[PDB]
Design a binder for this molecule. Structure first.
Ligand code: MG
Ligand code: MG
Ligand code: MG
Ligand code: MG
Ligand code: MG
Ligand code: MG
Ligand code: MG
Ligand code: MG
Ligand code: MG
Ligand code: MG
Ligand code: MG
Ligand code: MG
Lengths: 118, 205
RNA sequence: GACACGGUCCAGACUCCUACGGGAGGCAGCAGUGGGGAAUAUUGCACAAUGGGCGCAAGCCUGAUGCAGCCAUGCCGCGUGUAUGAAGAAGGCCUUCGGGUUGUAAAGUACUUUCAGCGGGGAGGAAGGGAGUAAAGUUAAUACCUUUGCUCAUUGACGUUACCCGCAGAAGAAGCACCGGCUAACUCCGUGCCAGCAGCCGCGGUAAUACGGAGGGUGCAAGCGUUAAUCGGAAUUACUGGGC
RNA sequence: AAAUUGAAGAGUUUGAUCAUGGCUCAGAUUGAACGCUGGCGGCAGGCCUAACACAUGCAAGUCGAACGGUAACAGGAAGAAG
């Protein structure tokens, strides 16, 4: 039942309000995830780079469930947390092989929301 | 006619882990990689020229459990056949029934999938074959024997097959418990860490 | 069709028998015996098939031939399990005395039963002729035949066959050579130019990666080694392809 | 279509070098043997020695539709019989 597998990939959704850390295999089947909002951080605390690192600490689970060891890194989103989280993976005992940005950049696609006059 | 000793010893020797053991439990945990066996293994061995050639040949053989005598017969056939010999030799090694069953996903290990073939549990084109070295020809359909399917080990091996990027030239069937050896494999698909030109020279010496 | 392997005549040697008067024999056919040598198989089965001889045929005749037995002698295939399994069990050996090493090897825990165990089925080799039939050709008579078709019953030495199916339980199945260089793979102990090894280079004279033992490791595998032999490498008799 | 296609060195002469020139090694391969070990099957092979001697059984017989025959058998009829 509880399986075991290495050579994963980590998808990083660095949004302006939250950071989503998901560890998955090479074929997109999710193995585990953790979020800043689910790590005890709300409001401003839910977006600070630090809390994003803390979210990674949670994702350090699945160890016995999946011996990922070496994993890929996918990063998308301009929000804070494009650096912190990455460190936490190293300090957790993981082999970061490649680091690439997968931020969606339209070539003049859909119309964006209007500006916040505030 | 078969290797029966420990497996992690060979794995950690010759260095790069290449398709051994069930494939679930992390390879590093079971042993100590980057350290050849033996009391003196913890040292840097200045390999030679013969050394490199020998290692490659030994490595290739173990990946497919082919004994020298057998492997040499493949080399003679590969040289006889038209085309580049090294890829032809690799194609012949991949075309063995036991290897194909392993890649098809019915066995956790090449040895276990080979045992499934040996124990008369595999059907090819409606004919019972229990010879691991049988050469599968293109467009053939390999189907697990009705009785065999009741083995829960086969079922679990299917599950794990998902992690290995399904070989293109093999059309695997899940619940259908069948496979179609579409065509011969190509060098590109095979692990790019194999230098077949080294193998060709070594046996041509 | 022979100067004739199981024909004859003669001579020679040997072989054996005889009632002494006289005879008989020739496995370089198949088994086999002794001998020789390092070293080569069962005094097997059946003519079922093929093949040949004779016979109208039916047949009979086959140590030809088909099979079987023996030897790992070679070639080829196969199996001796599969996964889990680390407080890296103990034990072994090393040890910088901290450890490491064996080794996930084991044990254990799931799992499977190839072949070998046993049991029960079951092709193919099998074509044939015979007995009949009916018609046809064949006649004086289409009697005789011979040609068809058919009909019945047929024959397998191998053979407890090829193969299939069930039975049970990892149970019954791994050695051999090497680890100084060439040449892949190392230390410890013993020994002290002793004993020894040695394809070449050479080791050993008291801290031997070379001998001997231990652990470990490398190659190959139901085989691994040694020896003998042929070619290669050896452009080292060179025509390709050499020199003085 | 295809059947034309493959060609490696190394160690040893010296204080060191080049050169000629040996020997030796790796590779194939056998109608092999010996040693150690040895589960099974398929296929092939198996006195290279003394054409040395050979115990013994067998390896060329068949044909009655060539003929005198009927030795042995089967029946067959006669003749008889408790
Ligand atoms: Mg004659
Ligand atoms: Mg004779
Ligand atoms: Mg004889
Ligand atoms: Mg008889
Ligand atoms: Mg006879
Ligand atoms: Mg059996
Ligand atoms: Mg070496
Ligand atoms: Mg073999
Ligand atoms: Mg020789
Ligand atoms: Mg020459
Ligand atoms: Mg010269
Ligand atoms: Mg006779």
């Amino acid at each position: 039942v509880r399986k075991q597998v290495s050579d994963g990939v980590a998808h990083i959704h660095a949004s302006f309000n939250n950071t989503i850390v998901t560890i998955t295999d090479r074929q997109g089947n999710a193995l585990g995830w953790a979020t800043a909002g689910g790590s005890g951080f709300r409001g401003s605390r839910k977006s600070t780079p630090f809390a994003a690192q803390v979210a990674a600490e949670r994702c350090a689970d699945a160890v016995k469930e999946y011996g990922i060891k070496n994993l890929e890194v996918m990063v998308k989103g301009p929000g804070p947390g494009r650096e912190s989280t990455i460190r936490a993976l190293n300090a957790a005992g993981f082999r970061i092989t490649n680091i690439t940005d997968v931020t969606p950049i339209p070539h003049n696609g859909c119309r964006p929301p209007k500006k916040r006059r505030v | 006619a078969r290797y029966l000793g420990p497996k992690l010893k060979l794995s950690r020797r010759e260095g790069t882990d290449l398709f051994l053991k069930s494939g679930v439990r992390a390879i590093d945990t079971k042993c100590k990689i980057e350290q050849a066996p033996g009391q003196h293994g913890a040292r840097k061995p200045r390999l030679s020229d013969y050394g490199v050639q020998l290692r490659e040949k030994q490595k290739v053989r173990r990946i497919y459990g082919v004994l020298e005598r057998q492997f040499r017969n493949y080399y003679k056939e590969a040289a006889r056949l038209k085309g580049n010999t090294g890829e032809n030799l690799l194609a012949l090694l991949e075309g063995r029934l036991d290897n194909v069953v392993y890649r098809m996903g019915f066995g956790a290990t090449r040895a276990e999938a080979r045992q499934l073939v040996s124990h008369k549990a595999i059907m090819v084109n409606g004919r019972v074959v229990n010879i691991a070295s049988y050469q599968v020809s293109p467009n053939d359909v390999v189907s697990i024997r009705e009785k065999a399917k009741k083995q829960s080990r086969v079922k679990a091996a299917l599950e794990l097959a998902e992690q290995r990027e399904k070989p293109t030239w093999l059309e695997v069937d899940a619940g259908k418990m069948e496979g179609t050896f579409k065509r011969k494999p190509e060098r590109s698909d095979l692990s790019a860490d194999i230098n077949e030109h080294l193998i060709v020279e070594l046996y041509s010496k």
